[PDB]
């Protein structure tokens, strides 16, 4: 249902949990890194530009 | 629900010791963080009622690119050091001061004549160095009240009067969320002054100016 | 609130004993008992374990002495 | 011929008009190329992908 | 109407027959979103078997990339037309010219790094004018086979579901035309006889609004009231 | 690509503009000048750094 | 010691739009209050966009009514292009009933008291028949910003996008004021565009009200 309490719970469970990001043609070992998520509206992954 | 806008109140003032200031504001309506940042930035930047150094003459020097012996530094360099000087003044408009001293050593801001009204805020700041037993320093510093940054060409050796007490003003905008709220703005004011006034009161003075400029409207 | 784990590697230079020591301590702090010896910032026991690494008071030796003494008790 | 068509209009010849930020509200230096491009939407829509 | 065209939109918009190509010229008597009636000029038209013409426009219907294919009339009422011309505009056609996207006001400057690699930035004015707004059509299927322990009933009686899940249905279990459906509600109640729910739902995470219900039935079975 | 363009534009020396040929005690008032508009972005100026 | 401006001039240079003038202002306040008022007058104003329209002979929004030439969707966009003024209510229902061959403009709407149309000659749609009558009931309510129908969400009540904005085109140009025994007085000229729903005096006054409340957020009055 995505009620009023669940989003605060999601911001609880993210805060210090890394995830792995991965472009599919993985050439070398910077093809996969780790990031701490920050929740963004919309439907597309925002990604730090230098990386 | 057309008049209501989400009035922020300042969640914290992470202030660092004397004049370094980091002031945050949240939550804000979509867009208004930039107009508040730009308004407070331009108002604190170009229009602040303050006082500074305006013109200094040397009693034995009639040129900018000149020197007096016994001094490790130059007169352009002490123009930089006098631009760094920070003074609060009583409601009298102008007053002349001086630096009449004969003595070996660094010349500090406390070794200026005190002269009643004028309160030097940083006695630890050093103007110039003297080293010889007979090299005497003597000049005539003239403060003035004003409301901006007045350069030399816009206007005896001239001093650009940085009347505004602020030294760095900058603001970033990050996202800050309330319950179901999609995109609400957050104002982060990072700011340094010269220490002639505490920074939060300077923010309130700038807001007071713009409040009068809107008091004419509504 | 933690961005780099550089100082943790400055205290244990092997960088893989880092992972085992921090994981062992954070497991023993996760499910039950043996409270963290640092103030927390409403953050998970991963960051707590690495933070107690960078305070120096966690390595393989402290876990050896404490697990051995809990065995003795 | 493009310069002549611009000269028929009110716009300057080089096409580089000065513009203004909404954040600062002041003038960018070095006036910029604006205009009207015909653009297209492609069928890689995000909710198909995500 | 693309600004910097090539002069090749005319031949494309004529020969790719998504528009209403006038087989004979004349004067348009009746215009509708459904159809266009063509009264032909007399010299252009046979003495015997004479009559007039009617062009049926193809309405909202499914494409093959699940986009929209639809025609719209471009000629006003009571109007001279010439033989071999468009009469109605279809998908991405305007006045007999191929208009794929839209012309927009555009600027080349680095803006806060939001355009970092190749990132096109779009102002909110564009989405407020609803002018990348597009239409997709999904064809959701549901079948009624017959296997062991019974056939596959199309009733509305569904075990352990909310009445809100039932409320967007008829008496039988097929959705009314016009329901603003949401992701997860039931279109057709399909039950497995044991009995267990396996009814057709919306694919998860899309909106929509039902425009049409086709129903086919193999011969030998009675139909309910909505069929 | 973008940020290197902005940096290369930010450190270069035009021969003359507003503020060319004065002195400044610190980079804080350099930023205060550039946000004012009372100077160039870039002009060969003797300042104090540390 | 700064010289406060006054609402010195309002000049209805056209039926749609007008220019206003701020005078006198000091140095620096020109671009400051110019960017400020531009950003507020684009950002958040009151407005009277169209929200929900219930056309009678319509099941869903992608059908086509017999007797009108356009699609019903294009009729909805033409309703989106409508401008309307209210005074005292936050919502209202309108009425359109018309048959016969001819254009159908907003001037045929029932012209109930506080409901006011400022562009009557704008077309909604055309017809083709003697006897085929469109008949729609239009809910218009107040609002602010942009409300798409996917957010805030009967089978006949269609939902269209909310276009709460009275303005499109805002500009400001600073210049000098009169001599007045004091130079450096800055004449602020705001040139705005309005469909005809909000008076420019009311617009600039509400803008000042909003920005004054946002300064009220921490400083006292």
Curated annotation (Swiss-Prot), chain A:
> What the entry says about post-translational processing?
Acetylated on several lysine residues in the presence of glucose.
Q: How is it used?
A: Co-administration of salinamide and rifampicin or salinamide and myxopyronin suppresses the emergence of resistance to both antibiotics.
At the top level, the lineage of the source is: Bacteria
The family classification in the record reads: Belongs to the RNA polymerase beta' chain family.
Q: How does it assemble?
A: The RNAP catalytic core consists of 2 alpha, 1 beta, 1 beta' and 1 omega subunit. When a sigma factor is associated with the core the holoenzyme is formed, which can initiate transcription. The rRNA transcription and antitermination complex (rrnTAC) consists of RNAP, NusA, NusB, NusE (rpsJ), NusG, SubB, ribosomal protein S4, DNA and precursor rRNA; S4 is more flexible than other subunits.
Role noted for this protein: DNA-dependent RNA polymerase (RNAP) catalyzes the transcription of DNA into RNA using the four ribonucleoside triphosphates as substrates.
Which protein is depicted?
DNA-directed RNA polymerase subunit beta'
Say which species the protein is native to.
Answer: Escherichia coli (strain K12)
The record's gene field reads rpoC
- What part of the full protein is here? 403 to 453 of 1407
Curated annotation (Swiss-Prot), chain C:
Q: What class of enzyme is it?
A: transferase
GO biological process, alphabetically ordered: bacterial-type flagellum assembly; bacterial-type flagellum-dependent cell motility; cell motility; cellular response to cell envelope stress; DNA-templated transcription initiation; intracellular iron ion homeostasis; nitrate assimilation; protein-containing complex assembly
Name any one GO molecular function: DNA-directed RNA polymerase activity
Keyword flag Transcription:
yes
Documented EC number(s) = 2.7.7.6
The protein's UniProt keywords, in alphabetical order, are: DNA-directed RNA polymerase, Nucleotidyltransferase, Transcription, Transferase
Cellular component (GO) terms are: cytosol; cytosolic DNA-directed RNA polymerase complex; RNA polymerase complex; transcription elongation factor complex
Could you confirm whether the keyword Nucleotidyltransferase appears in this record?
yes
Catalysed reaction per UniProt?
RNA(n) + a ribonucleoside 5'-triphosphate = RNA(n+1) + diphosphate
The domain of life is Bacteria
Quote the function comment for this protein.
Answer: Promotes RNA polymerase (RNAP) assembly. Latches the N- and C-terminal regions of the beta' subunit thereby facilitating its interaction with the beta and alpha subunits. Part of the processive rRNA transcription and antitermination complex (rrnTAC). The complex forms an RNA-chaperone ring around the RNA exit tunnel of RNAP. It supports rapid transcription and antitermination of rRNA operons, cotranscriptional rRNA folding, and annealing of distal rRNA regions to allow correct ribosome biogenesis.
Q: Which family does it belong to?
A: Belongs to the RNA polymerase subunit omega family.
Q: What is this protein called?
A: DNA-directed RNA polymerase subunit omega
Native source species: Escherichia coli (strain K12)
UniProtKB/Swiss-Prot annotation, chain D:
Q: How is it modified after translation?
A: Acetylated on several lysine residues in the presence of glucose.
Could you tell me the superkingdom of the organism this chain comes from?
Bacteria
Practical uses of the protein: Co-administration of salinamide and rifampicin or salinamide and myxopyronin suppresses the emergence of resistance to both antibiotics.
Give all N6-acetyllysine modified positions. Answer: 7
Biological function:
DNA-dependent RNA polymerase (RNAP) catalyzes the transcription of DNA into RNA using the four ribonucleoside triphosphates as substrates. Resistance to the antibiotics salinamide A, salinamide B, rifampicin, streptolydigin, CBR703, myxopyronin, and lipiarmycin can result from mutations in this protein.
What family, per the record? Belongs to the RNA polymerase beta chain family.
Give the quaternary structure: The RNAP catalytic core consists of 2 alpha, 1 beta, 1 beta' and 1 omega subunit. When a sigma factor is associated with the core the holoenzyme is formed, which can initiate transcription. The rRNA transcription and antitermination complex (rrnTAC) consists of RNAP, NusA, NusB, NusE (rpsJ), NusG, SubB, ribosomal protein S4, DNA and precursor rRNA; S4 is more flexible than other subunits. In pull-down experiments interacts with CedA. (Microbial infection) Interacts (via flap domain) with Escherichia phage lambda antitermination protein Q; this interaction renders bacterial RNAP resistant to transcription pausing and allows it to read through termination signals.
Swiss-Prot record, chain G:
* Any one of the GO BP annotations: cell motility
Report the superkingdom from the record: Bacteria
Which stretches are annotated as coiled coil? none
Q: Which reaction does it catalyse?
A: RNA(n) + a ribonucleoside 5'-triphosphate = RNA(n+1) + diphosphate
What keywords appear on the UniProt entry? Answer: Acetylation, ADP-ribosylation, DNA-directed RNA polymerase, Nucleotidyltransferase, Transcription, Transferase
Post-translation: what modifications?
(Microbial infection) ADP-ribosylated on both alpha subunits by the phage T4 protein ModA. ADP-ribosylated on only one of the alpha subunits by the phage T4 protein Alt.
> Care to name a GO molecular-function term for this sequence?
DNA-directed RNA polymerase activity
Q: Does the keyword Membrane apply?
A: no
Q: Which terms in the GO cellular component ontology are assigned?
A: cytoplasm; cytosol; cytosolic DNA-directed RNA polymerase complex; membrane; transcription elongation factor complex
Q: What is its EC number?
A: 2.7.7.6
* Annotated spans, Alpha N-terminal domain (alpha-NTD): 1-221
User: Self-association or partners: how does it assemble?
Assistant: Homodimer. The RNAP catalytic core consists of 2 alpha, 1 beta, 1 beta' and 1 omega subunit. When a sigma factor is associated with the core the holoenzyme is formed, which can initiate transcription. Both the N- and C-terminus interact with different regions of transcriptional regulator CRP. The rRNA transcription and antitermination complex (rrnTAC) consists of RNAP, NusA, NusB, NusE (rpsJ), NusG, SubB, ribosomal protein S4, DNA and precursor rRNA; S4 is more flexible than other subunits.
The family classification in the record reads:
Belongs to the RNA polymerase alpha chain family.
Listed name of the protein: DNA-directed RNA polymerase subunit alpha
Tell me the organism. Answer: Escherichia coli (strain K12)
Q: Which residues of the full protein are shown?
A: 7 to 234 of 329
């Amino acid at each position: 249902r995505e009620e009023a309490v669940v989003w605060d719970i999601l911001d609880e469970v993210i805060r210090e949990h890394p995830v792995l990001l991965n472009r599919a043609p993985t050439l070398h070992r910077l093809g996969i890194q780790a990031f701490e998520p920050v929740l963004i509206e919309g439907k597309a992954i925002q990604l730090h530009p230098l990386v | 629900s057309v008049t209501e806008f989400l009035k922020p109140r300042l969640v914290d003032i992470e202030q660092v010791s004397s004049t370094h200031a980091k002031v945050t504001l949240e939550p804000l309506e979509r867009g208004f963080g930039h107009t508040l940042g730009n308004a407070l930035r331009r108002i604190l930047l170009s229009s602040m009622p303050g006082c500074a150094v305006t013109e200094v003459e040397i009693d034995g020097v009639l040129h900018e690119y000149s020197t007096k012996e016994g001094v490790q530094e130059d007169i352009l360099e002490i123009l930089l050091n006098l631009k760094g000087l920070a003074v609060r003044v009583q409601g009298k408009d102008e007053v002349i001061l001086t630096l009449n001293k004969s003595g070996i050593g660094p010349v500090t801001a406390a070794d200026i004549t005190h002269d009643g009204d004028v309160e030097i805020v940083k006695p630890q700041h050093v103007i110039c160095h003297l080293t010889d037993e007979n090299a005497s320093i003597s000049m005539r510093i003239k403060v003035q009240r004003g409301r901006g940054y007045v350069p030399a060409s816009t206007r005896r050796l001239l001093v650009d009067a940085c009347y505004s007490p602020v030294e760095r003003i900058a603001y970033n905008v990050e996202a800050a969320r309330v319950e179901q709220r999609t995109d609400l703005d957050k104002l982060v004011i990072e700011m340094e002054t010269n220490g002639t006034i505490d920074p939060e009161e300077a923010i309130r003075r700038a807001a007071t100016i713009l409040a009068e400029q809107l008091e004419a409207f509504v | 609130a933690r961005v780099t784990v550089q100082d943790a590697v400055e205290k244990i230079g092997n960088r893989f004993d880092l992972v085992l020591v921090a994981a062992r301590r954070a497991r023993q702090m996760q499910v039950g008992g043996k409270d963290p010896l640092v103030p927390e910032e409403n953050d998970k026991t991963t960051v707590i374990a690495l933070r107690e690494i960078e305070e120096g008071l966690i390595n393989n030796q402290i876990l050896d002495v404490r697990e051995r003494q809990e065995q003795q008790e | 011929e493009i310069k002549e068509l611009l000269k028929l209009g009110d716009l300057p010849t080089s096409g580089q008009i000065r513009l203004y930020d909404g954040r600062t509200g002041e003038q960018f230096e070095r006036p910029v190329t604006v205009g009207y491009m015909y653009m297209l939407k492609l069928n890689h829509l995000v909710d198909d992908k995500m | 109407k693309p600004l910097v065209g090539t002069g090749m939109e005319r031949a494309v918009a004529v020969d790719s027959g998504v528009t209403a190509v006038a087989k004979r010229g004349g004067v348009v008597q009746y215009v509708d979103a459904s159809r266009i009636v063509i009264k032909v000029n007399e010299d252009e038209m046979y003495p015997g078997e004479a009559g007039i013409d009617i062009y049926n426009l193809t309405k909202y219907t499914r494409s093959n990339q699940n986009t929209c294919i639809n025609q719209m009339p471009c000629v006003s009422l009571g109007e001279p037309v010439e033989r071999g011309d468009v009469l109605a505009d279809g998908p991405s056609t305007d006045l007999g010219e191929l208009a794929l996207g839209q012309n927009m006001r555009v600027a080349f400057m680095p803006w806060n790094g939001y355009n970092f690699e190749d990132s096109i930035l779009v102002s909110e004015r564009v989405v407020q004018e609803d002018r990348f707004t597009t239409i997709h059509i999904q064809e959701l299927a549901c079948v009624s086979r017959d296997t062991k322990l019974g056939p596959e009933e199309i009733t509305a009686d569904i075990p352990n579901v909310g009445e809100a899940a039932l409320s967007k249905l008829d008496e039988s279990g097929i959705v009314y035309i016009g329901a603003e459906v949401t992701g997860g509600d039931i279109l057709v109640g399909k039950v497995t006889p044991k009995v267990k729910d396996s009814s057709l739902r919306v694919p998860n995470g899309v909106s929509g609004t039902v425009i049409d219900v086709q129903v086919f039935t193999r011969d030998g079975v009675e139909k309910d009231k909505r069929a | 690509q973008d940020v290197v363009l902005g940096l290369y534009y930010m450190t270069r020396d035009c021969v003359n503009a507003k503020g060319e040929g004065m002195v400044l005690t610190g980079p804080k008032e350099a930023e205060r000048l550039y946000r004012s508009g009372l100077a160039s972005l870039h002009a060969r100026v003797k300042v104090r750094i540390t």
